[PDB]
Design a protein around this ligand. Sequence first.
Ligand SMILES: NC(=O)c1ccc[n+]([C@@H]2O[C@H](COP(=O)([O-])OP(=O)(O)OC[C@H]3O[C@@H](n4cnc5c(N)ncnc54)[C@H](O)[C@@H]3O)[C@@H](O)[C@H]2O)c1
Ligand SMILES: NC(=O)c1ccc[n+]([C@@H]2O[C@H](COP(=O)([O-])OP(=O)(O)OC[C@H]3O[C@@H](n4cnc5c(N)ncnc54)[C@H](O)[C@@H]3O)[C@@H](O)[C@H]2O)c1
Lengths: 319, 319
Amino acid sequence: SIPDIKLSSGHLMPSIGFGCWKLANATAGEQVYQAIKAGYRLFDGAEDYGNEKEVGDGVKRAIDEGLVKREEIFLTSKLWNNYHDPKNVETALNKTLADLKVDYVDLFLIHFPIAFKFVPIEEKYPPGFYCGDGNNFVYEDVPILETWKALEKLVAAGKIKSIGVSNFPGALLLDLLRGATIKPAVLQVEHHPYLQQPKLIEFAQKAGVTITAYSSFGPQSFVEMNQGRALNTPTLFAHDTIKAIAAKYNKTPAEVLLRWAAQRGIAVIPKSNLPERLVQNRSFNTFDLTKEDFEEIAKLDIGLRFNDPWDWDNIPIFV
Amino acid sequence: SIPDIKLSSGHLMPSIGFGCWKLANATAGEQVYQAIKAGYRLFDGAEDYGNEKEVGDGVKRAIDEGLVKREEIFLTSKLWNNYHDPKNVETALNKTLADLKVDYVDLFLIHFPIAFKFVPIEEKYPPGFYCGDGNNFVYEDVPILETWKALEKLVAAGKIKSIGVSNFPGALLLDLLRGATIKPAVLQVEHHPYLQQPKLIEFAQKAGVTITAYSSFGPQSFVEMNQGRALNTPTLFAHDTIKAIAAKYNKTPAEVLLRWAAQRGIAVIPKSNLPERLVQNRSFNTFDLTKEDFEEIAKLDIGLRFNDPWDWDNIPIFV
Ligand SMILES: NC(=O)c1ccc[n+]([C@@H]2O[C@H](COP(=O)([O-])OP(=O)(O)OC[C@H]3O[C@@H](n4cnc5c(N)ncnc54)[C@H](O)[C@@H]3O)[C@@H](O)[C@H]2O)c1
Ligand SMILES: NC(=O)c1ccc[n+]([C@@H]2O[C@H](COP(=O)([O-])OP(=O)(O)OC[C@H]3O[C@@H](n4cnc5c(N)ncnc54)[C@H](O)[C@@H]3O)[C@@H](O)[C@H]2O)c1
């Protein structure tokens, strides 16, 4: 029932997944296990989420019970910013593999086009914004392509099935395509009605790169973290445009928000943090939006970005 | 006196220059020669402008009459898109040097972070958008850093004093700084009240990169090319905000537009196509805009870009 997308790598990737950012450690394993019982097969994780061992526990439990086999589960993880230097890339992936308790991850992404100074795993893990000097940000001179080639070698070694990037703007993705032997299979970016970036989506799709949207509910994820920008932003769940379209199809605003991406061939990985949302968030493909619906939703695009490294340390990723 | 800006390379660059884009071949020499007599010392040219031989004639005449010496002139040129493959960078630079009739250029910029297929000079020069296959765009898989390293060797060879880039968004500039041995001394970008990109400016200046603005009068240069977007755009010369401020100081809108950039440490290279403009375009540093003036002008920033490769072939530089 959940459609698969064939990546440029030749592997299939479920079009609807389960988001693991801020999935609490104490309950992450139980939540992943229940997600698997509910039919989810892709888990969007990251070294920075600091809960890969627990995500690994939930998957292992489902496998041990015979609910699924490892090859039926799609695990995505992401290389954190302190690990871009080629000599530390495999080290970080090995930590991910050991925590997830698997021999390979299905998709491994460069989390951000930012290279923090390396911090040894024994000193702090996950390091977050820590760069080895108190609260100061410290960076290292590692071009993206050096990190990409280190990843390409790890695909040849069988430790990663498909590789991609997250939080890359068009000029950067284009330059990487010039040096890549294995083309990035996935571009994972913030994508919701207030930040539609239609030209980025069009370029990447035409290049054969698959888009995975994150924060499909816009400000909501950041409101939950007390972010001022998101708290100040009218919710998409109560926006008249979204509500009118939902009422027209007798669907919920959340279903409209997910379908809007899905219908355009964009993969989604919503955070389903309540049993009812688990079902709601994988059952929305029951109606089609029309060109007019897309034109009405297109009016919400105001280029409002909630996940921005400019907020961390004025890092110019999106300027 | 035109203040100088000290570049990260150690060389001084006039903060006010004479733009050579669209300077007609038949009169370019005389115009450059008159600009020199009027006090201009920096000439912003490019292979794509197709008039470097004539710009060279104007500079040579002035040197031959003893008005200036080579060392007092700052010549900027730019590497066009078809010449990014390393082996073609020196040949393209040599063509520029032979046309300008000099042994070195003071500043050489990568014109766009775009790599068109190489076209021999004898086949077509300047090639513009021609890529060797009728009207089709054809590209080369040459990462920006390879091109940059080729430029660095040319600085070592004494053929270029300072190197830089043009039309680079923040993420791409940041990645280049990670691989660059000689840091880009200049970032030249479209810059006017409708496209302020304050964060990009702030990031580059803090990184020690000097900004050169082009199209300081906004839609005007593109209106002069029958461009649809520009023709349908309220001119900055009649915009109420600019008008009010020019009136307040008994300045022309053009002088306000140039000082707005200059007062913020940004170099300007206005195309002065009339004798009176020639004088005014380098004599506008006689007043300071106030914090409120800046605040008022900041309200015009709508992100309207007139020079966008997306219009050429949906090239994702700015998305
Ligand atoms: N690569 C990146 O930089 C990056 C950044 C952020 C998120 N992501 C990924 O994408 C995932 C999803 O994004 P997100 O976590 O920011 O949040 P989201 O937008 O999926 O959900 C945000 C919130 O909305 C609520 N919600 C979910 N389903 C709902 C429903 N049916 N009805 C009403 N409210 C509902 C929940 O409170 C939830 O926490 C993450 O868990 C992570 O895996 C990646
Ligand atoms: N790197 C790049 O991609 C790039 C692109 C475009 C231009 N440039 C450079 O920057 C220069 C300046 O930019 P531009 O030529 O696009 O336009 P501009 O904004 O300097 O001037 C545009 C037009 O306004 C008029 N003008 C000039 N001075 C005036 C004055 N005092 N009062 C009233 N009108 C006046 C002229 O008709 C002129 O053609 C170019 O000549 C070129 O050297 C670089």
